[PDB]
């Protein structure tokens, strides 16, 4: 009860933001937190239900914009697990031999099978490079840690194959979540590692600590809130283990040794404080990590339209970093 | 009233924090709005009272850290200009031919003198770089652009002297705001730029644009809220400028060629937005800018007690870029 008590805030869209978040944003109604708090799953079946209805129109929606860039999304399997390779029709010149394999965000359980390739896509094209999806096992079917163990099984078939030094790793919340429990496995492991990071609004702490879960409540339009769903899932995850344990929150583990790291979040999204104490937390270990932060961007924001100027900046600052890093 | 309505939020102190930040949030009382919505000088005499009121104990915690740090701090006068040398025990090898050129922050009006040495005390000390803080002309008894003016008289003063290369530039809030100022002038002169730039919590944009004006609003500690003083402040500032005119809120002038930058807000900072757009105009502008976001840290929080890991990492970062980019 030594906490704040904040009144109720006004938020106008937000004029520093290009005219297409700002549009966006603007089309958006007040984020409700009622939905989120009362879609609560207890039940296998119940979990079915809810993540059936949260993926919906996410494979057409991944489809729609393959087709519109010419982005090839193909279905494989690598030692039994379920994969998507997606070839942008352009691949930078010094990315030509260098592949990014990508872990799908999600809170956890969402964004299985195709659903999960829209920010393959985005990374795909707008970063110029090749990118690996892994469709890792997710709850409730496959418990913890049946997504870490695909996403390592991948990573160690790579590794026959060529230099981790070639490879860029990562992606957003629940998958960015994996990628560093995986690279903190690999390092205790003294398994290469991957030529870089990219950490989009990882899901590094998911016990409710980090300000933006409280300040961004009702204000990030896509989580909305911790309560309810966030949480659930996350407890679904966690299978019994503490939220603080870093093998559910990584962000508590040690973060020495990191790849070069590239982390972007924005002012709206509920895992902002996630995403800088993890870049702080890089620094500090250091590790180089260069972090972005949109005006007017909440939870994923930054991989939604592929017009907006954050959106086309962002991944050209993602292209130049591998460029740097990757070799 | 295409904004969104906010409900009531309880921000607890933030565990992600330092023990040391975690304590000072806590032991914070919850920001109270009306005290700043209802100082609103509107007489020069109203102005010198609620300045004066403002700057109380500034210069006693300057003579304290500058005490207990075995920092020296003396004041000259250059071509006319208050100034302040700030000498620390310590100057890293490499920023012995250095120096830090530091333009304090407040809100356009305050830290007059030697209340404004305080945070060149902490970036001499922990950045271990000779400071020169300019005590530059301010409202209401010297209308702007005086404080323009004397920024640029020291700064061209020191070119007569040496190498803008072995020069850093910057400050906080006010400061920050004159800093990306003459750095336009300085570019579209033709004149010879610092090596680097410091800017802490900018005030780069100071209409009430940014959403953490809207989203700190009784959030951030220190300005608590942009309506009332902060905004009347801006006005004096202004003195009759659109607030959007570059000359007030450089953010909207011309950022390429900018010197490499450094950036330091935090998740409570009101001006978040500010310094978040700031790094992203200059990135975009291919200028070379380092972003620190502190999880709990609110306008200038970075810059208040010298035994916060974040400020002890923020500065040991600003000694680093510091060494990379001043030759
Ligand atoms: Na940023
Ligand atoms: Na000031
Ligand atoms: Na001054
Ligand atoms: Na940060």
Redesign the interface.
């Known amino acids: 009860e ?15 933001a290009s005219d297409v978040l700002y549009n966006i944003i ?1 089309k958006t109604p ?2 409700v ?1 009622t939905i989120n708090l009362n879609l609560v799953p207890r039940t296998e079946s119940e979990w079915r239900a809810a993540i059936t209805q949260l993926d919906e129109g996410k494979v057409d929606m991944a489809r729609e914009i393959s087709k519109q860039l010419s982005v090839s999304v193909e279905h494989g399997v690598i030692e039994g697990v379920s994969v998507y390779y997606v070839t942008p029709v352009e691949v930078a010149p010094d990315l030509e031999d260098k592949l990014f394999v990508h872990t799908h965000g999600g809170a956890f359980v969402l964004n299985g099978g195709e659903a999960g390739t829209i920010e393959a896509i985005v990374i795909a094209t707008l970063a110029k490079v090749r990118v690996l999806s892994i469709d890792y096992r997710m709850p409730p079917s496959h418990p913890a840690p049946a997504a870490r163990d695909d996403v390592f099984t991948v990573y160690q078939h790579l590794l026959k194959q060529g230099s981790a030094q070639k490879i860029a790793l990562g992606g957003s919340s629940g998958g960015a979540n994996l990628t560093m429990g995986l690279v903190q496995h690999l390092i205790e492991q003294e398994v290469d590692l991957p030529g870089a990071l990219f950490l989009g609004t990882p899901g590094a ?1 998911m016990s409710k ?4 879960y ?6 990030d339009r896509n989580l909305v809130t911790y309560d309810g769903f966030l949480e659930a899932a996350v407890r679904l995850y966690a299978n019994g283990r503490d939220l603080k344990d870093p093998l559910v929150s990584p962000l508590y583990g040690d973060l020495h040794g990191f790849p070069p790291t590239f982390l972007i979040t924005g ?2 999204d509920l895992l ?2 996630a995403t ?2 993890t ?2 937390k890089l ?2 270990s250091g590790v180089v990590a ?7 961007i909440a939870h994923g924001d930054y991989a939604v339209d592929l017009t907006a ?2 959106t086309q ?1 962002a991944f050209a ?1 993602l292209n130049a970093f591998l460029l740097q890093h990757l070799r």
């Open positions: 030594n906490s704040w008590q904040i009144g109720p805030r006004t938020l106008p869209a937000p004029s520093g603007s007040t984020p937190p702490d600590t980090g300000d933006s409280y300040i961004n409540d009702g204000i002012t709206r902002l404080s800088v104490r870049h702080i620094r500090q260069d972090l972005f932060v949109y005006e007017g100027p954050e900046h600052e």
